[PDB]
Subunit: 110 residues, 6 copies
């Protein structure tokens, strides 16, 4: 059982990249396809963030970082906001939150 927040980051990066491409194309088919892919990719990023909190992070980590529980919840809600938006900024906000989890993850691995 190997863990890495890179899995959440890669899927969230895809969400932002899809949002950016939606602003440069008018086509109803492309807009629909991009919305389908974004939905799937965002749900996968949420799954990876959830698994880290559920299976990797243990009681001493929640004691050492009392803000971790809320950070992970805020990340999931940021990803949910990105899932329902075409705005690349919401995709970036989700990535900013994942970056904070990534920092904490590696501090617990040292």
């Amino acid at each position: 059982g190997v863990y890495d927040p890179a899995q959440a980051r890669i899927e969230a990066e895809s969400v932002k990249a899809v949002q950016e491409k939606m602003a440069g194309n008018d086509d109803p088919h492309f807009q629909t396809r991009a919305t389908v892919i974004k939905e799937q990719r965002a749900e996968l990023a949420k799954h990876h963030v959830s698994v880290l909190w559920s299976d990797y992070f243990k009681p001493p980590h929640f004691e050492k970082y009392p803000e971790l529980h809320q950070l992970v919840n805020d990340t999931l809600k940021a990803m949910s906001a990105a899932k329902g938006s075409k705005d690349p900024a919401t995709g970036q906000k989700a990535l900013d939150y994942i970056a904070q989890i990534d920092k904490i993850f590696w501090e617990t691995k040292k």
Copy 2:
């Protein structure tokens, strides 16, 4: 978007029912099949508990119930313990934790 912890409870009930049936049969094939089904069912219960915490529960719920973040994490770890055990008691412990989430869920719906 409808939510109900019954989805987590039904899948966790299946996990306990599978654990109980493992004590009454010696057969290597049945033991293997039951282990495969238990793994799948436990992961589904974990997914349903995760979705409630991620998508249903909002900031005022975490403020009103300061123990909710840790209750949900303890539930996931209890389900993970049940996933790796043949003991029906570990399956019951997971159900006891889901019952506490179910009580809080309905209090937020009133």
Copy 3:
């Protein structure tokens, strides 16, 4: 095994709830996202209805309730009609059919 038509009902209620929301929100992005969600929720509802018919209901139940076979086929088709529609009444027709299966299910539990 542990069975309950509540699994089918919850997914079917989600389909109707998505249909209700589509009626009051004109946004093309939301309309597309709602269509993706409705498609998978209806497919999940169909899975649950199918499982009860194949795995729970045995030959004595089909003998006592001769219309059960056709009721389940009608329910599945009503769910496919709901999957292809934005109208809440189609989601309600599928829920009315699940309510008929739910009634029969509990009579066999007594």
Copy 4:
């Protein structure tokens, strides 16, 4: 869409029977377990395809023309569930026999 074929159900059921046959040859505990995992997934996929034909392809007049179809499909699904829980190739064959009966009715509905 409109593109359905019992071959999807048959291929997955053939895989179930093929796995049951391979289990009798190799006694290795790891292979026995891997085979059980694959059989479980393949059997549920065979069940999905059979159920899809019954609900999505077959229409109401097909059930009037073939009053046995409802019961035949249920027996196929139960036969597949029996195969899922067994290492015996005979159970996998029973599921294939039932699928062969659905296949016959399918191609008749394609002609008239």
Copy 5:
């Protein structure tokens, strides 16, 4: 297991082309969206089946006997990706044409 068949790839690719054809008839925004969702899922499943044949069925001497197979399979997958992004039935047909070429090589490996 040992039970493989290009029909699985073909049926899913036929569903992709059938959806592309249905999109030209009904202009309803809800149907256009539902069709796009189904096409995306069906196209990825067609890609999975083609990739499985290439890695799990086809063995090393098959690539010596058919030096074009590696490139043919990649072109099939790319043709399917093109169909996934288009409403045009001609793209779905191109994917089926490539699958027909894989199908021919498959049945030759079953004979000798």
Copy 6:
């Protein structure tokens, strides 16, 4: 689109880690659970390797690296061999092959 062989590497590392754990824990229940986990992790690794070959790598990359087609087929087969084995060396062979794809991938990003 956003691609990275890290997705294939992480799943492949999980396969090797499960193989390592199977070597030091005799329990039949754990052995079965580990086999289920290893089976899906290897299948996910195969999916990722296949996606890079079909969706990322284009005709100029196959022209510049003539052995890339066979390298990817060998990697997928090594992963299937790892899926059917408890030996960590098979998991490592699949990781060595992914490392060769990773090297080529980054050279095309420059």
